[PDB]
Amino acid sequence: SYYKGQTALHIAIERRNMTLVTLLVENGADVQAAANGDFFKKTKGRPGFYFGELPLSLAACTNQLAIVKFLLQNSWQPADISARDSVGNTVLHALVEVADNTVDNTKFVTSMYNEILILGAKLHPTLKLEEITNRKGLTPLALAASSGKIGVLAYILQREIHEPECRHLSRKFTEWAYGPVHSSLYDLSCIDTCEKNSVLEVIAYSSSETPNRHDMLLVEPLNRLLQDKWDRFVKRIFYFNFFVYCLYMIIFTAAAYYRPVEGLPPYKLKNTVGDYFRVTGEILSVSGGVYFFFRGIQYFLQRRPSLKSLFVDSYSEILFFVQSLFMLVSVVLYFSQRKEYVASMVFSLAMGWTNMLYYTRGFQQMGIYAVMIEKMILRDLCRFMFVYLVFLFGFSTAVVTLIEDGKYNSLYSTCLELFKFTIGMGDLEFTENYDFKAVFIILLLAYVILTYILLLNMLIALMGETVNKIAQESKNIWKLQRAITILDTEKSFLKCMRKAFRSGKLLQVGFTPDGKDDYRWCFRVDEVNWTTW
């Protein structure tokens, strides 16, 4: 079950013995044998060398170029290309999987990919390999995007072939040139809407464990595409949403600040404009709360994220949902003849007012600032509050034990009195009902010194990690957030209208190997080159 399924052809391929390989091939044995041994499984045990489970993929991934040439160019029985293993991976998929984001590995992988692609196209120009997908419905480009293989994606997106009868296999072209300025083109097919899974959709919605999510959207066409879509319509849509939200919040706060104080609601309205205005404000606030509730529930139902990805991601949907829940609980208590609805409503109001930082994205500097705040809150509060709480509780218990009897003889009062020392208004002489003044003074001084040292070390440790590697990360995270906003806004079609569209129709290659021409939704980019003429 471990070494089972192996065949002499695999050994011959992986020993680099061209003569022995040829002699073994001449025997007439099948060249499509598959090894099912657990040693060849994906991740069933740390030992393992996944290679696509076929000898051709062994040649492809094991530095074998002349060998694969011989296998595919032998008149005896050439090895088929479209063969898919148990998992469904093809030779191209295996090549993508073998990549590990290393310069030598990346150059090797791209070279082998190009060679196999050109050979297959030459031998069988009718068939196209890039459209063949495994069980999971992932194309080689989509698979590379999902696994965060930067090199393969970068090479594929701007693949250029400079050989006759092979131009149509490339994606980047050169429509025209003049002097030092020449205009290129890029194929957007299977980038914005492939009808199964686009590169943008897969990269944007991928969970955080993927290696290089932040640094992947710097590839050439994608950045310009996102910027273009934004400047085209997302700016206007986002600003309108911002305005509507601000208006709603102003209405809510104005309506709530004037709540009547009589006791035991509900309250009977009076025949005056004020009461009608207040009722309208309450109705508007409740409608907004329930609308946000449905939007949040819909998003959570559709995405269905994990548990540890519900704080690293979706950090704002949770907050909006919580605000909606508070509003709903408040109204339920209001109609049940209670008096806690005030507390619920004020909690909701404060949270909603402070939850408007989400709209800074779209303003570069402010977006970066908000991202920094979010990262600090998520990555330092838990690590830096436990120690302070431990110190505070220890010294509070000690001091409360010392005192004999009085107003500060409980635990909450003394906890507050010791907390006051951190907002810089401690007293040091707040009680006199005890004995052994030396003990009291010593304890208070020790607490003050320890907490000041703790805060100083907090600050220095926080600054240390910023060795100037804090802007290059914040900017990338902000760009990713804007990208997800653009994708979401495009997905949620505005009203009944639909005008968003990638770019203009165009003819670039002239004609395919077949007589008919073709169109590929190009996206022209103009560049100026001065050196390397």
376 touches its own copies by CB under 8 A: yes
If DSSP codes are grouped into helix, strand and coil, which group holds residue 302?
Answer: helix
Q: Which of 449, 416, 530, 528 is nearest to 184 (CA)?
A: 528
Is residue 93 within 8 A of residue 135, CB to CB? The reply is no
SS3 assignment for 16-61: CCHHHHHHHHHCCCCCCCCCCCHHHCCCCCCCCCCCCCCHHHHHHH
347 touches ligand 3PH by CB under 6 A: yes
Distance of alpha carbon 472 from alpha carbon 480, whole angstroms: 13
Distance of alpha carbon 525 from alpha carbon 176, whole angstroms: 11
268 touches its own copies by CB under 8 A: no
- What the block records as the tokens of 253 is 């706060």
- What the block records as the tokens of 265 is 């609601």
Is 302 or 468 the residue whose CB approaches its own copies more closely? 468
For residue 342, the minimal CB distance to ligand 3PH (Å) is: 8
Is 423 or 496 the residue whose CB approaches Na ion more closely? 423
If DSSP codes are grouped into helix, strand and coil, which group holds residue 409?
Answer: coil
Among 131, 195, 432, 526, binds its own copies (CB under 8 A): 526
Among 247, 283, 310, 462, binds its own copies (CB under 8 A): 462
Distance of alpha carbon 205 from alpha carbon 35, whole angstroms: 35
Q: What residue type is assigned to position 356 of the chain? A: M
If DSSP codes are grouped into helix, strand and coil, which group holds residue 131?
Answer: coil
Q: Which does 386 bind (CB under 5 to 8 A by kind): its own copies, Na ion, ligand 3PH, none?
A: its own copies
For residue 380, the minimal CB distance to ligand 3PH (Å) is: 14
183 touches its own copies by CB under 8 A: yes
Q: For residues 28-67, which are near its own copies according to CB under 8 A?
A: 46-49, 51, 62-63
Binding track over 132-151 against its own copies, x by CB under 8 A? --------------------
Q: For residues 408-467, which are near Na ion according to CB under 5 A?
A: 424-425
493 touches its own copies by CB under 8 A: no
| Residue 258 DSSP label | T
User: Judged by CB under 8 A, which stretch of 285-293, 458-466, 485-493, 515-523 contacts its own copies?
Assistant: 458-466
Angle at which helices 235-257 and 341-354 pack, to 10 degrees? 150
Q: Which does 331 bind (CB under 5 to 8 A by kind): its own copies, Na ion, ligand 3PH, none?
A: none
Distance of alpha carbon 49 from alpha carbon 52, whole angstroms: 9
For residue 348, the minimal CB distance to ligand 3PH (Å) is: 9
70 touches ligand 3PH by CB under 6 A: no
Is 195 or 405 the residue whose CB approaches its own copies more closely? 405
Q: Which of 410, 432, 430, 431 is nearest to 420 (CA)?
A: 430
Alpha helix locations (H) across 174-260? 199-205, 213-216, 220-229, 235-257
Distance of alpha carbon 305 from alpha carbon 299, whole angstroms: 10
Q: For residues 262-291, which are near ligand 3PH according to CB under 6 A?
A: none
Binding track over 415-454 against ligand 3PH, x by CB under 6 A? ---------------------x-xx--x---x--------
340 touches ligand 3PH by CB under 6 A: yes
If DSSP codes are grouped into helix, strand and coil, which group holds residue 174?
Answer: strand
Mark the binding-site residues for Na(+), compressed into ranges: 424
Distance of alpha carbon 307 from alpha carbon 269, whole angstroms: 46
Q: How many helices (H) and strands (E) does the chain have?
A: 20, 3
266 touches Na ion by CB under 5 A: no
User: Judged by CB under 6 A, which stretch of 202-210, 238-246, 346-354, 457-465 contacts ligand 3PH?
Assistant: 346-354
Is 312 or 445 the residue whose CB approaches Na ion more closely? 445
Is 18 or 461 the residue whose CB approaches its own copies more closely? 461
347 touches its own copies by CB under 8 A: yes
Distance of alpha carbon 115 from alpha carbon 461, whole angstroms: 51
Residue 352, CB half-sphere, CA atoms under 13 Å: how many? Answer: 25
Mark the binding-site residues, compressed into ranges: 3-6, 14-15, 315-316, 354, 361, 424, 427
Among 71, 96, 345, 522, binds its own copies (CB under 8 A): 345
Among 126, 337, 401, 531, binds its own copies (CB under 8 A): 401
Residues binding ligand 3PH (CB under 6 A): 340, 343-344, 347, 350-351, 354, 436, 438-439, 442, 446
